[PDB]
């Protein structure tokens, strides 16, 4: 896509922001390693909706992104 943009801003003052790196990596990794979307369009959907509800459900929103996805995943395949 001509005239594209990737960067956002050169304001690296808060560490929480840098987290975007680790988080993004964990996402692409889990998406590439386990592309549920490619397995079942319905699967990825349920995982998404639940992944968003499981993020607001808990009060410890300041938790590691690893737990959010981890819980959202295991919960998706819960009996």
């Amino acid at each position: 896509m001509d005239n594209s943009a990737s960067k956002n801003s050169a304001i690296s003052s808060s560490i929480f922001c840098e987290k975007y790196k680790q988080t993004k990596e964990q996402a692409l990794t889990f998406f590439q390693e386990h592309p549920q979307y490619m397995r079942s369009k319905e699967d990825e959907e349920q995982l998404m909706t639940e992944f968003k509800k499981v993020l607001l459900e808990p009060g410890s929103k300041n938790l590691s992104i690893y737990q959010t996805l981890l819980a959202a995943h295991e919960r998706l395949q819960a009996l």
Binding site: F16, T23, F31
Partner: protein
């Protein structure tokens, strides 16, 4: 004699169609991350 009732309906109403704007490639994971940072404390960029 009087009227039965006062019916309602559109009046000089207008509307604008807006079918455009989409993502791809990064949006796949972006959605997840965006939600994590959006639910965590606040957006970031």
């Amino acid at each position: 004699h009087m009227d039965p009732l006062t019916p309602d309906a559109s009046e000089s109403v207008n509307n604008i169609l807006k079918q455009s704007g989409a993502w791809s490639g990064d949006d796949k994971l972006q959605k997840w991350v965006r939600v994590y940072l959006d639910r965590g404390q606040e957006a970031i960029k």
